[PDB]
Design a protein around this ligand. Structure first.
Ligand SMILES: O[C@H](COc1ccc(Cl)c(Cl)c1)CN1CCC(Nc2nccc(C(F)(F)F)n2)CC1
Lengths: 1034, 150, 100, 50, 50
């Protein structure tokens, strides 16, 4: 096949042009995102039941929905939580590879069938089903500096003016508003209501009656009278549109005729739908917009379009309003992608430089410069054909495969040049001979590398997807590299190279090139002499190989395991947790302290703090909060102390002094969608209907038992809230009946006053908005205020709550959790240093096995994936080894020679492990993929050496030792000039300390160490293996 | 999947027109075979439980989990889950001048769980230090509680 | 029994807000009538799977579904694949003349 | 696969059953499927031997 | 027309505009493909040009 294209250079050029055009089209059309879809598809059902506690929401909402979640396909599991804020959130996690749209529609349809079973208030608020597996591309904050506007005003302006245009922007998959529109608010005064002998029920009824839309017909509508000439539509009562109209709503008229309008007993004002969450941006009122990218959309282009649309908005904004970007990771993504592209380009340049240094022929150096970009473009085209996208994993896969591509080009070009220099043949016949020598080896190497890299794609779950990214990328790059080396590279060698003499090795050259040449023949002679001396004492080097293997096992077992390096993305989060029962003001004070610290002590690094009072992770209440701290540009933060890790450690140390609050600063997970992968997630399930208290006791016992094992488990804590005091009101039905007051009226008055009620809608500036009736804050603060509220009995006399009710304080859960439809409690933990997560989970299972009767357990989150993919690696790599052995036996036509090639893996693995250990890195995904790349390249070198030696023994009459020595002499130069090029290409990643330095270092350090040791050891261990194997079996 | 999606898309138009009792009993749309894949029976080898108890246990502790298993298209319970059964005596109702309407109204009023709001709820007053959930009438959980309805 | 402007603001805009995130969408049209009817048509690119497009439109619509007035829910919001032309018209007459 | 998943779920449930409760399988066509497939495979092996 | 009043095409007109817009690209790509195929088959850059 190489001979076909050697005689047809134009056909090979046409093939290369086609590949380049396809790659360019793919680059133009390929989506770009930081990461692909890694986490399993998940669908979240969210409902709100205003004024309701956790138990009320769970009993009336959560349990019904969970009982009606049946018949949905590919559901891995289902969890739910009901808060004291009145919010239920149910996450259904489906198996990987499930169509998210189909799962989402099935979940919606089962909820639509369950909807009639829910409270009317829950139905009125609406139950929303979303896909929660995705994260936010961007978060655009809107702030007011003049102080004229508040959070509600800014949120309403964003909803009315900004949301639509952002949604219409190209590539904007989803837009969610951090806040709510305006809503009419009826702040009831209990004393005024008692004075006029009214109750909140009357206000609700009047508002419903006097704010509605009525269908009214048409003048002349059909069936029509015989000569009708005019047809028109009749307009009747329409919804109110202003606070003034609501003010005049009439609730009663006095005997005298003075009118008891609505404003008499309440304050009418436009406010927020919910006041639970307060937002500030550097201590200024703010609202937000979270923007999620669409499918197949370019993240960079989408961010640019969003910014352009916001700039278009800017001139029309009300004076004093400003756009800010509290959370913008797109710059980090851009820098990472640009750094990878720069790495690839510099790799090509280093290949050119090394090729010129060794061969000292410009036309020879041109050939790899044409070959490698063609393979890269073909790889892009193949990725587009498979539906992949340009992301961090794919780009680093290309970076890793660059070494294989460089080796493929260098082998062909150097072999052709060596044949020309030795036999003196002209370029065409020299190329023919070289390809006749190396083509079978190249095909066998293609098969071997396919066997090595394909199995990654068959891991299960999130790790399966992460490894499949690299697997597809590298396998496609390798296949295109081999195809190019068989099609185009020989044609380029035959057409571009110029004749070289039968004996010229360059030693006649005058300056640095001549010195380097002569030094190189001297070094090659010394290397051949050393190898020959080695082959006479093979036993010592066999025991040395055993020592190397033992050291490899030691380093592997003693190396920690990780998932993905933590990156300095320019943003981190501080979570604030106040004691139970804390109010919004105390959390606001703590958040103000945190913001002041960040903007004063860390003023050089931090540019903005987005404080969110009322919402924090693993909670939703007044006693929780979260601040999203954004750092200045990496170029403005030079040093190791000005990075996210150091900043977070300093902030945590400073905040540990804060009293009456737990404040903890931390960096983002590498993949926020998967969240943390640090430890284990454990679910303790109530299986026998024990109750909340018994489950709490079981959880406490398990936590104590885990704490009694410091050396195996660390920071085993509950991922939930503890029980808190609650105000219980016991309404005596007998007393209420005796005094002539209905229980329904009492409950309605209490709920409307102290929790608020949603009555109906109105039209504000041509937008439908909600109407809420609630007590004024002054009269719904303390238990004593219960005495300020009166209910009208059937007799028309107002009776107090104390007359027909009593009060006390009890304990209740502010957040109730369920797993797979049963009550549960979530425990988060992690293995102690030096302990694997598997044995930590085994110990947790052993501890849980001793818990009281009726208490079960389950694994969720990352633990579920770990259980799924626990045993895949050994079997997959056993299959890989078997297939590699079979391919090598096919290549060499021998059942024993393949062992000489396969004995080379430890040579690179040991160096990779040593490099990782010395730099204090972990066994993460990047390290493993780099390990596979190093193993593949070392196997390539060994395969070529053994092929040359065997061909020398068979086609010629040379003996074992002579053939091996000649083979190593022939293969020394390509090995060295590939290792040097790849090592120098990866050095920038090794020494990188800027943005994205985590993944860069993880990819670079292991690769560099593995290449160094693979080269150095293999160049004189492979001949030993070949000689020993040939002697043993022959 | 698409067939079920379209069928229930059309069914959602009829749902508002169906009687409230039908909606409250739960309308189901399913895609499954006409024949049972299998039958998982449950007995008691000690003889302590009756048919009602076994059926309630299967409905409450095993039915939902099986229904959520992938590949399960339908689950038919050979029994029924427990429920609070009020067996009315017409003679007693007439003696006290009562009607099943009155019984239903009393059950609805005195067996309910109401959202009662919060102490120190947002918007709060300045200087508010306490925030708590107000608990009120809760659903009854025993036959004794139901028998005490006035 | 709703005006064209009122139904457009209360219904048409609300629905149209959440329909901009659907895949393979070429363009969108909508008409609001004084009879209270709202008709929105989303035209997708050629070769798009119609069933998947309809499923995605349902998924986006259910988000805005609660925001519509209770009367809209009572009558119901329908999402279905549509065509703008009649394949044929089948008329029925009474030759005798005994049926109006 | 569905039968295997159902049996796995029942195994999860079983440890928490009340005293005396027992699961039985009064109707299951799956064992016939397994035995039939096994018999055909056995026939193939015996055919190779013959 | 006054400022703020734009226009667009729909239905048949959208398809007609798209076809007219993408015709020249189609011609160029087809010519390039034929040229490359001729060069590949006849092993020359002169025969495809002629
Ligand atoms: O995951 C979502 C977004 O969380 C964030 C938020 C900010 C950043 Cl910068 C980032 Cl990165 C992430 C969670 N989210 C929390 C509250 C929000 N509801 C709200 N309501 C009123 C005001 C606000 C606030 F504070 F965001 F303006 N939010 C709705 C759901």
């Amino acid at each position: 096949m190489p001979n076909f294209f050697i005689d047809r250079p134009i056909f090979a050029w046409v093939i290369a042009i086609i590949i380049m055009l396809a790659g360019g089209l793919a680059i133009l059309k390929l989506p770009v995102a930081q990461y692909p879809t890694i986490a399993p598809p998940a669908v979240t059902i969210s409902a709100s039941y205003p004024g309701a506690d956790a138990k009320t929401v769970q009993d009336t909402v959560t349990q019904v929905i969970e009982q009606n979640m049946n018949g949905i396909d590919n559901l891995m599991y289902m969890s739910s939580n009901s808060d004291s804020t009145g919010t239920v959130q149910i996450t259904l996690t489906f198996e990987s590879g499930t169509d998210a749209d189909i799962a989402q529609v099935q979940v919606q349809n089962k909820l639509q069938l369950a909807m009639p079973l829910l409270p009317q208030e829950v139905q009125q608020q609406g139950v929303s089903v979303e896909k929660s597996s995705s994260s936010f591309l961007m978060v655009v904050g809107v702030i007011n500096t003049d102080g004229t506007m508040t959070q509600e005003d800014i949120s309403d302006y964003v909803a009315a003016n900004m949301k639509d245009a952002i949604s219409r922007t190209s590539g904007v998959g989803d837009v969610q508003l951090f806040g709510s529109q305006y809503a009419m608010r009826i702040w009831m005064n209990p004393n005024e209501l008692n004075k006029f002998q009214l109750t909140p029920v009357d206000v609700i009824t009047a508002i419903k009656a006097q704010n509605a839309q009525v269908a009214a017909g048409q003048l002349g509508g059909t069936p029509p009278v015989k000569g009708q000439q005019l047809n028109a539509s009749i307009i009747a009562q329409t919804r109110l549109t202003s606070t003034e109209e609501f003010g005049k709503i009439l609730l009663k008229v006095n005997q005298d005729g003075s009118r008891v309008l609505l404003r008499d007993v309440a304050k009418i004002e436009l406010g927020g739908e919910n006041y639970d969450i307060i937002a500030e941006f550097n201590g200024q009122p703010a609202s937000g917009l979270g923007i999620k990218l669409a499918t197949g959309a370019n993240a960079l282009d989408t961010a640019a379009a969003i910014r352009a649309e916001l700039a278009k908005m800017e001139p029309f904004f009300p004076s004093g309003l400003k756009i800010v970007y509290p959370y913008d990771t797109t710059p980090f993504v851009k820098i990472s992608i640009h750094e990878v592209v720069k790495t690839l380009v510099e790799a090509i340049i280093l290949v050119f430089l090394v090729m010129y240094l060794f061969l000292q022929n410009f036309r020879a150096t041109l050939i790899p410069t044409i070959a490698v970009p063609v393979v890269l473009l073909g790889t892009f085209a193949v990725l587009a054909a498979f539906g992949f996208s340009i992301n961090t994993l794919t780009m680093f896969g290309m970076v890793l495969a660059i070494g294989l591509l460089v080796d493929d080009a260098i082998v062909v070009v150097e072999n052709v040049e060596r044949v020309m220099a030795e036999e003196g043949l002209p370029p065409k016949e020299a190329t023919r001979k070289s390809m006749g020598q190396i083509q079978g080896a190249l095909v066998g190497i293609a098969m071997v590398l396919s066997a090595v890299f394909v199995p990654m794609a068959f891991f299960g779950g999130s790790t399966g997807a992460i490894y499949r990214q690299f697997s597809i990328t590298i396998v496609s790059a390798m296949a295109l590299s081999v195809l190019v080396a068989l099609i185009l590279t020989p044609a380029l060698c035959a057409t571009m190279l110029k004749p070289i003499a039968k004996g010229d090795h360059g030693e006649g050259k005058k300056g640095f090139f001549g010195w380097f040449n002569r030094m190189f023949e001297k070094s090659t002679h010394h290397y051949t002499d050393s190898v020959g001396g080695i082959l006479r004492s093979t036993g010592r080097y066999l025991v040395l190989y055993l020592i190397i293997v033992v050291g490899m096992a030691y380093l592997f077992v003693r190396l920690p395991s990780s998932f993905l390096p933590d990156e300095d993305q320019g943003v981190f989060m501080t979570m604030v947790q106040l004691p139970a029962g804390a109010t919004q003001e105390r959390t606001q004070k703590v958040l103000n302290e945190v913001t002041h610290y960040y903007l004063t002590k860390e003023k050089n690094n931090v540019e903005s703090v987005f404080a969110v009072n009322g919402f924090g992770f693993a909670g939703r209440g007044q006693n929780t909060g979260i601040a999203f701290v954004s750092l200045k540009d990496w170029a403005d933060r030079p040093g190791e102390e000005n990075k996210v890790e150091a900043i977070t450690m300093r902030a945590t140390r400073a905040f540990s002094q804060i009293k009456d609050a737990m404040v903890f600063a931390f960096n983002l997970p590498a993949i926020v969608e998967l969240g943390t992968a640090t430890g284990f997630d454990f679910e303790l399930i109530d299986q026998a209907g024990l109750g909340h208290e018994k489950l709490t006791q079981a959880r406490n016992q398990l936590l104590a038992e885990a704490a009694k094992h410091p050396d195996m488990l660390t920071s085993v804590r509950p991922n939930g809230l503890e029980d808190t005091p609650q105000f219980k009101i016991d309404i005596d039905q007998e007393k209420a009946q005796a005094l002539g007051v209905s229980i329904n009226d009492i409950n309605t008055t209490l709920g409307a006053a102290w929790g608020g009620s949603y009555v109906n809608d109105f039209i504000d500036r041509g937008r439908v908005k909600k109407v809420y009736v609630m007590s004024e804050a002054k009269y719904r603060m303390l238990p004593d205020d219960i005495g300020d509220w009166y209910v009208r009995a059937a007799d028309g006399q107002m009776v107090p709550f104390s007359a027909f009710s009593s009060s006390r304080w009890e304990y209740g859960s502010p957040r109730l959790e369920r797993y797979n439809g049963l009550p549960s409690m979530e425990i988060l933990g992690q293995a102690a240093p030096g302990k694997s997560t598997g044995e930590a989970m085994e110990l947790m299972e052993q501890l849980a096995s001793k818990l009281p009767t009726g208490v079960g357990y389950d694994w969720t989150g990352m633990s579920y994936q770990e259980r799924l993919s626990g045993n895949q690696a050994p079997s997959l790599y056993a299959i890989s080894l078997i297939v590699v052995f079979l391919c090598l036996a096919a290549l060499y036509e021998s059942w024993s020679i393949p062992f000489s090639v396969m004995l080379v893996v430890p040579l690179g693995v040991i160096g990779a492990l040593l490099a990782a250990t010395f730099r204090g890195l972990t066994n993460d995904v990047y390290f493993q993929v780099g390990l596979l790349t190093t193993i593949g390249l070392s196997a390539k070198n060994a395969i070529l050496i053994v092929e040359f030696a065997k061909d020398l023994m068979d086609k010629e009459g040379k003996g074992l030792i002579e053939a091996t020595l000649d083979a190593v002499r022939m293969r020394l130069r390509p090995i060295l000039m590939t290792s040097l090029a790849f090592i120098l290409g990866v050095m920038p990643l090794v020494i990188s300390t800027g943005a994205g330095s985590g993944a860069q270092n993880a990819v670079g350090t292991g690769v560099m160490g593995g290449m160094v040791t693979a080269t150095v050891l293999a160049i004189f261990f492979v001949p030993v293996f070949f000689v020993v194997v040939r002697r043993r079996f022959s």
